[PDB]
């Protein structure tokens, strides 16, 4: 009856507030998805609890063990009732869980340290000086693993065998790795996160190239859950009334220090 919301610490969606040590409950948190849970709760008439996904992951199926990890796994195993996160709508996920219509559009993009002589994914695939990677257990890695597109296939072959490992555990770690690597690491991440960090101190990074694809974040519920109907309605209503646009501006543009 209290709705269990699974979410992920990813700026600016869900962030620890400044006085979070002294705070209790959903009040420890802020960000885009924090706000959005509140709007979705008000419109659906539920009470809820924000919970940070136990393994820190978005969601992959172990092609060995066939087990879902991340927020996807929590929905699959009935550990959460809904996921309110930058969670990418994909086919393999759509086969196991329900998604709202998207609340945000995005595609994979390239983050470089300012001055990095890379304009494109093709640039990246044509060279070996600049290492490049993606996050584990998330849609971006899967994108490169399944790509039949020549350039993205080549990037995948490189990435899966690169030493030391190119993949990172969290986006924050990818982002630090571009920042510390002096131009010798480029990070493959969604446009939305890329654009956010581009407007944050120390202002040393930038999105280059076009988006590599076009996709969306949805609210996810366990397959067949009775919440799914009202939450999808809520999302479309929130979009239509201009509330998702206001919240994007709150969290990205009014948050900008560059």
Ligand X SMILES: N[C@@H](Cn1oc(=O)[nH]c1=O)C(=O)O
Applying CB under 8 A, among 21, 24, 64, 95 the residue interacting with a second copy is: 95
Write out the two tokens for 186: 């480029």
* Local structure of residue 131 (DSSP, 8 states): E
Q: Does residue 1 belong to the site contacting a second copy (CB under 8 A)? A: no
Would you say 191 is a known binding-site residue? no
**Angle, in degrees to the nearest 10, between helices 150-161 and 139-146:** 110
Residue 58 binds: one of ligand X, a second copy, none (C-beta under 5 to 8 A by kind): ligand X
CB of 86 to ligand X, least distance (A): 5
Interface positions, 60-89, toward ligand X (CB under 6 A): 86-88
Site mask, ligand X, residues 44-63, x = CB under 6 A? --------------x-----
Four-CA torsion 229, 230, 232, 233, nearest 10 degrees: 120
Identify the three-state secondary structure at position 207. strand
Name the token pair of 62.
Answer: 């172990």
Cα-Cα-Cα-Cα dihedral sign, residues 104, 105, 108, 114:
negative
Structural contact between residues 120 and 209, judged by C-beta atoms closer than 8 angstroms: yes
Q: Is 156 in the site for ligand X (CB under 6 A)?
A: no
Does 96 bind a second copy (CB under 8 A)? Our answer is no
Binding mask 116-155 for a second copy (x = CB under 8 A): ---------------------------x--xxxx------
Answer positive or negative: Cα dihedral of 50, 55, 56, 58. Answer: negative
The answer to whether 86 is annotated as binding is yes
Contact 238, 180 (CB under 8 A): no
The residues facing 105 across adjacent strands are 216
Q: Any binding-site annotation on 88?
A: yes
Binding residues for L-glutamate: 86, 88, 93, 139-140, 190
Residue numbers at the binding site for a second copy (CB under 8 A) = 89-91, 94-95, 99, 101-102, 105, 143, 146-149, 213-216, 218, 232-233, 236-237, 239-242, 244-245
Residue numbers at the binding site for ligand X (CB under 6 A) = 58, 86-88, 135, 138-140, 171, 189-190, 193
């Amino acid at each position: 009856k209290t709705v269990v919301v699974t979410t992920i610490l990813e700026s600016p969606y869900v962030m620890m507030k400044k006085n979070h040590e002294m705070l209790e409950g959903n009040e420890r948190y802020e960000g885009y998805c924090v706000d959005l849970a509140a709007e979705i709760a008000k419109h659906c008439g539920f009470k809820y609890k924000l919970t940070i996904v136990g393994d820190g992951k978005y969601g992959a199926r172990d092609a060995d063990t066939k087990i879902w990890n991340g927020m996807v796994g929590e929905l699959v195993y009935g550990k959460a009732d809904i996921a309110i996160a930058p969670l990418t709508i994909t086919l393999v996920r759509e086969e196991v869980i329900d998604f709202s219509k998207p609340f945000m559009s995005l595609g994979i993009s390239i983050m470089i340290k300012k001055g990095t002589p890379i304009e494109s994914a093709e640039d990246l695939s044509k060279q070996t000086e600049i290492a490049y990677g993606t996050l584990d257990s998330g849609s971006t890695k899967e994108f490169f693993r399944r790509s039949k597109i020549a350039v993205f296939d080549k990037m995948w072959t490189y990435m899966r065998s690169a030493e030391p490992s190119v993949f990172v555990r969290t986006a924050a770690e990818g982002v630090a790795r571009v920042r510390k690597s002096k131009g010798k690491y480029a990070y493959l991440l969604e446009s939305t996160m890329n654009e956010y960090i581009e407007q944050r101190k120390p202002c040393d990074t930038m999105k280059v190239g076009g988006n590599l694809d076009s996709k969306g974040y949805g609210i996810a519920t366990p397959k067949g859950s009775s919440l799914g109907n009202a939450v999808n309605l809520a999302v479309l209503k929130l979009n239509e009334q201009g509330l998702l646009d206001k919240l994007k501006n709150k969290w990205w543009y009014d948050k900008g220090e560059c």
